[PDB]
Write an enzyme that holds these catalytic residues in place. Structure first.
Site, PDB file in Angstrom:
ATOM      1  N   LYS A 155     -23.106  70.960 -57.468  1.00  0.00           N
ATOM      2  CA  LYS A 155     -23.319  72.404 -57.302  1.00  0.00           C
ATOM      3  C   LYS A 155     -22.791  72.914 -55.957  1.00  0.00           C
ATOM      4  CE  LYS A 155     -27.418  71.868 -60.190  1.00  0.00           C
ATOM      5  NZ  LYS A 155     -28.675  71.096 -60.145  1.00  0.00           N
ATOM      6  N   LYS A 203     -32.319  58.577 -69.876  1.00  0.00           N
ATOM      7  CA  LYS A 203     -31.864  59.657 -70.757  1.00  0.00           C
ATOM      8  C   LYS A 203     -32.355  59.512 -72.199  1.00  0.00           C
ATOM      9  CE  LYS A 203     -29.499  61.139 -67.101  1.00  0.00           C
ATOM     10  NZ  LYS A 203     -28.174  61.811 -67.278  1.00  0.00           N
ATOM     11  N   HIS A 257     -18.989  68.058 -60.685  1.00  0.00           N
ATOM     12  CA  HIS A 257     -20.387  68.118 -61.154  1.00  0.00           C
ATOM     13  C   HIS A 257     -21.432  68.304 -60.047  1.00  0.00           C
ATOM     14  CE1 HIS A 257     -18.417  66.790 -64.836  1.00  0.00           C
ATOM     15  NE2 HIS A 257     -17.999  65.719 -64.183  1.00  0.00           N
ATOM     16  N   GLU A 263     -31.159  67.137 -68.551  1.00  0.00           N
ATOM     17  CA  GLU A 263     -32.034  66.239 -67.798  1.00  0.00           C
ATOM     18  C   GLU A 263     -33.098  67.000 -67.025  1.00  0.00           C
ATOM     19  OE1 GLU A 263     -28.938  65.426 -64.002  1.00  0.00           O
ATOM     20  OE2 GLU A 263     -30.212  63.821 -64.782  1.00  0.00           O
ATOM     21  N   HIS A 288     -24.480  76.281 -66.554  1.00  0.00           N
ATOM     22  CA  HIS A 288     -25.595  75.457 -66.112  1.00  0.00           C
ATOM     23  C   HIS A 288     -26.735  76.392 -65.745  1.00  0.00           C
ATOM     24  CE1 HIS A 288     -27.408  71.934 -63.842  1.00  0.00           C
ATOM     25  NE2 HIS A 288     -28.173  72.959 -63.513  1.00  0.00           N
ATOM     26  N   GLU A 334     -32.960  71.011 -66.432  1.00  0.00           N
ATOM     27  CA  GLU A 334     -31.565  71.441 -66.455  1.00  0.00           C
ATOM     28  C   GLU A 334     -31.053  71.560 -67.880  1.00  0.00           C
ATOM     29  OE1 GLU A 334     -29.170  68.906 -63.924  1.00  0.00           O
ATOM     30  OE2 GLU A 334     -29.912  69.909 -62.108  1.00  0.00           O
ATOM     31  N   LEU A 355     -20.137  70.559 -75.776  1.00  0.00           N
ATOM     32  CA  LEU A 355     -20.252  71.939 -75.317  1.00  0.00           C
ATOM     33  C   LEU A 355     -19.099  72.272 -74.372  1.00  0.00           C
ATOM     34  CD1 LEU A 355     -24.089  71.722 -74.736  1.00  0.00           C
ATOM     35  CD2 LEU A 355     -23.037  73.065 -76.566  1.00  0.00           C
ATOM     36  N   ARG A 382     -24.098  76.521 -50.390  1.00  0.00           N
ATOM     37  CA  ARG A 382     -24.250  75.262 -49.667  1.00  0.00           C
ATOM     38  C   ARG A 382     -23.162  75.153 -48.615  1.00  0.00           C
ATOM     39  NH1 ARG A 382     -26.125  70.273 -53.442  1.00  0.00           N
ATOM     40  NH2 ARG A 382     -27.271  71.462 -55.036  1.00  0.00           N
ATOM     41  N   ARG A 422     -38.545  66.246 -59.052  1.00  0.00           N
ATOM     42  CA  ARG A 422     -38.575  66.400 -57.592  1.00  0.00           C
ATOM     43  C   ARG A 422     -38.287  67.864 -57.287  1.00  0.00           C
ATOM     44  NH1 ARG A 422     -33.185  67.461 -56.691  1.00  0.00           N
ATOM     45  NH2 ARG A 422     -31.711  66.366 -58.092  1.00  0.00           N
TER      46      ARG A 422
END
Length: 373
Positions: A167, A116, A165, A217, A138, A205, A133, A267, A221
Site C-alpha cells: 500500500k 488461508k 502489493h 485475508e 482493495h 481485507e 478478479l 506513507r 493486529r
C-alpha cells in the site's frame, strides 16, 4: 489501566503506542536493538532495554529477549504493534504462558486466520463473502472486538494505490461505498468476530469489484493505516486496544459509530525515487507540516539517522477534511510543507498521486499506480 507495558516494536508505530500509553497513564518500556537507541519513542519512554544487535532476527523477532525484558522491568502486557511478531501465534502463546497480557487476539485465533485454508472456511461458515478478479479495488473493514461477545465495525478503507502489493496511499471511507453496502459488509465482519472469538483490533481485507466483496485475508493486529479510520470516526484505536487488553468490555456501541468527513494517508519512505530502492541515512533538516486537519505520524527528527536494517517507511502524513476534495487539497499542501533533507524520499511521488486526475475522481483499481508509473 495496565500499570506498565512493553512496546515490542520500533519506528512510527512504537511512538504511536507510547503516546496512547502516556494519555492513559500507562508506564512504558521501550525494547530496542543496538541500532535504535536514538528512536524518538526510546528517548521518550519511561524505561528502555537493549534486546539485541541490529538485525531484526536477533532483536525485534527475538522472543526470549522480549519476554526477558518484560519480566525484568515488571511489565504486565506487551503490545506487538504491526509486522514483526504481531501475527506470530507462537509469540502470543508464550506471552500469555509467561503470565503477561498480549495486546491482541488469542494465539488460536492468530493461527486460525494466519492460514488461508482455515481462514476461508471460518469466513464461509460465518457468512462473510469469499471468492467463489481482474479489475478490483482493495477495500478493508476495520473491526474492534473485546473477546467478551461484543464486536463493532468502524467503516472501511480503500487501499488500492499499491506498488508490488504494498500500500502507498490509504483513505477512509472508500469512495462509492454507500451507507447500505457499508452496513452489509460491516455486519458480516462483526458477526465473524463473534463467531471466531476475536479479541482486539483487526482488519478484514476484501477485493471489491462490480459491487461485490470477496474476502482475501484478516490482519489480526492494528493496521498501518489505522489513523484514517480514527479521523473519520473519532475512535482512538490504540487506546481501545489497551482498554480491551485491560479486560474492559467495548465502551462503544455500533450505533455510536458515525462516519464523518474523509481522510487520506500518504506513507513516507526513505527510498530512491528513480529505483524505489531503500535510501537510509542521516536527516539533516526536518520540518513537519501543520494546519487544520493535518496529522503527522513519525519518529523522525533533525539529525536522526534512518538505519539500513529495517523497513523504509519513516512516517505517515494523514489529512482530514469535511469531504474527499478538501482532504486531498490539504494533503497537497502538507506534502509541499514537509521538509526531509539529507535522504531521498517518495514525497514527490505522493504529490504526483494527489495531482492525478483519476485519483481525484476516485475509485481507481489495484493495478492503477503501476500502470501510471
Amino acid at each position: 489501566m495496565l500499570d506498565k507495558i512493553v512496546i515490542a516494536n520500533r519506528g512510527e508505530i512504537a511512538l504511536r503506542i507510547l503516546r496512547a500509553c502516556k494519555e492513559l497513564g500507562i508506564k512504558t518500556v521501550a525494547v530496542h536493538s543496538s541500532a535504535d537507541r536514538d528512536l524518538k519513542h526510546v528517548l521518550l519512554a519511561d524505561e528502555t532495554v537493549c534486546i539485541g544487535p541490529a538485525p531484526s532476527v536477533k532483536s525485534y523477532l527475538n522472543i526470549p529477549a522480549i519476554i526477558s525484558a518484560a519480566e525484568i522491568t515488571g511489565a504486565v502486557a506487551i503490545h506487538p504493534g504491526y509486522g514483526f511478531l504481531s501475527e506470530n501465534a507462537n509469540f502470543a502463546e508464550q506471552v500469555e504462558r509467561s503470565g503477561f497480557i498480549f495486546i491482541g487476539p488469542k494465539a488460536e485465533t492468530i493461527r486460525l486466520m494466519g492460514d488461508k485454508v482455515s481462514a476461508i472456511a471460518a469466513m464461509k461458515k460465518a457468512g462473510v463473502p469469499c471468492v467463489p478478479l481482474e479489475n478490483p479495488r482493495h477495500v478493508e473493514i476495520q473491526v474492534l472486538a473485546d473477546g467478551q461477545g461484543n464486536a463493532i465495525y468502524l467503516a472501511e478503507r480503500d487501499c488500492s494505490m499499491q506498488r508490488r502489493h504494498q500500500k502507498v496511499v490509504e483513505e477512509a471511507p472508500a469512495p462509492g461505498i454507500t451507507p447500505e453496502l457499508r452496513r452489509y459488509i460491516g455486519e458480516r465482519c462483526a458477526k465473524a468476530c463473534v463467531d471466531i472469538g476475536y479479541r482486539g483490533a483487526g482488519t478484514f481485507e476484501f477485493l471489491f469489484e462490480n459491487g461485490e466483496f470477496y474476502f482475501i485475508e484478516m490482519n489480526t493486529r492494528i493496521q498501518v493505516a489505522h489513523p484514517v479510520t480514527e479521523m473519520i470516526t473519532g475512535v482512538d484505536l490504540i487506546k481501545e486496544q489497551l482498554r480491551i487488553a485491560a479486560g474492559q468490555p467495548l465502551s462503544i456501541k455500533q450505533e455510536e459509530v458515525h462516519v464523518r468527513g474523509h481522510a487520506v494517508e500518504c506513507r513516507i519512505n526513505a527510498e530512491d525515487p528513480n529505483t524505489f530502492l531503500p535510501s537510509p541515512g542521516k536527516i539533516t533538516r526536518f520540518h513537519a507540516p501543520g494546519g487544520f486537519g493535518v496529522r503527522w505520524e513519525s519518529h523522525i527528527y533533525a539529525g536522526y539517522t534512518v538505519p539500513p536494517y529495517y523497513d523504509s517507511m519513516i512516517g505517515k502524513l494523514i489529512c482530514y477534511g469535511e469531504n474527499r476534495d478538501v482532504a486531498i487539497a490539504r494533503m497537497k499542501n502538507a506534502l509541499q510543507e514537509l521538509i526531509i533533507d539529507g535522504i531521498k524520499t517518495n514525497v514527490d511521488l505522493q504529490i504526483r498521486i494527489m495531482n492525478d486526475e483519476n485519483f481525484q475522481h476516485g475509485g481507481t483499481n489495484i493495478h492503477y499506480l503501476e500502470k501510471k508509473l
